[PDB]
C-alpha cells in the first residue's frame, strides 16, 4: 500500500498467531519489539536512541508478517511502548520513501 504521514504510520503485523500494531520507522536500523517471551536463546545488546541507550534481548531469524508481507530477521525485545519495524525488515518488503 501507500502510507501517508499525517499520523504515525502504525500497521498490523503478525508474529506467530498473534496480531499486533507496529510503527514503520525508516529512522531505525533495527526492529524493536515490546517485551514478549520468544523461544530460543538471545544475546544481550544496547541500542541507542534520542535520549540514550536501553538494554534489549536479541533474537535472530524471527518471521514477522507486515501487512501480509513476510520478512525474516533479527529482532530486539525491550521495554518500548510501541513495536518498531526498522530498516532490516522494511527492505525485505520492498518499502521505499517517495516524494
Ligand X SMILES: CC(=O)N[C@H](C(=O)N[C@@H](Cc1ccccc1)[C@@H](O)CN(CC1CCCCC1)NC(=O)[C@@H](NC(C)=O)C(C)C)C(C)C
Could you say which residues in the range 43-82 bind a copy of itself, by CB under 8 A?
47-54, 67, 69, 80-81
Name the 3-class secondary structure at 89.
Answer: helix
- Residue list 8-37, contact with ligand X (CB under 6 A): 25, 27-30, 32
If the CB atoms of residues 17 and 51 are measured against ligand X, the closer one turns out to be: 51
Q: Are 73 and 62 in contact (CB under 8 A)?
A: yes
Distance CA 95, CA 26 (A): 9
Strand partners, 21: 12
For 20, the 3-state DSSP assignment is: strand
Hey, which residues between 25 and 44 contact a copy of itself (CB under 8 A)?
25-29, 32
Q: Where along the sequence are the contacts to a copy of itself (CB under 8 A)?
A: 1-6, 8-9, 23-29, 32, 47-54, 67, 69, 80-81, 84, 87, 90-91, 93-99
Amino acid at each position: 500500500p501507500q502510507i501517508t504521514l499525517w499520523q504515525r504510520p502504525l500497521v498490523t503485523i503478525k508474529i506467530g498467531g498473534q496480531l499486533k500494531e507496529a510503527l514503520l520507522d525508516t529512522g531505525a536500523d533495527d526492529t524493536v519489539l515490546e517485551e514478549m517471551s520468544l523461544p530460543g536463546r538471545w544475546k544481550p545488546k544496547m541500542i541507542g536512541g534520542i535520549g540514550g541507550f536501553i538494554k534489549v534481548r536479541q533474537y535472530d531469524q524471527i518471521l514477522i508478517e507486515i501487512c501480509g508481507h513476510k520478512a525474516i530477521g533479527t529482532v530486539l525485545v525491550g521495554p518500548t511502548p510501541v513495536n518498531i519495524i526498522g530498516r532490516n525488515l522494511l527492505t525485505q518488503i520492498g518499502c521505499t520513501l517517495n516524494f
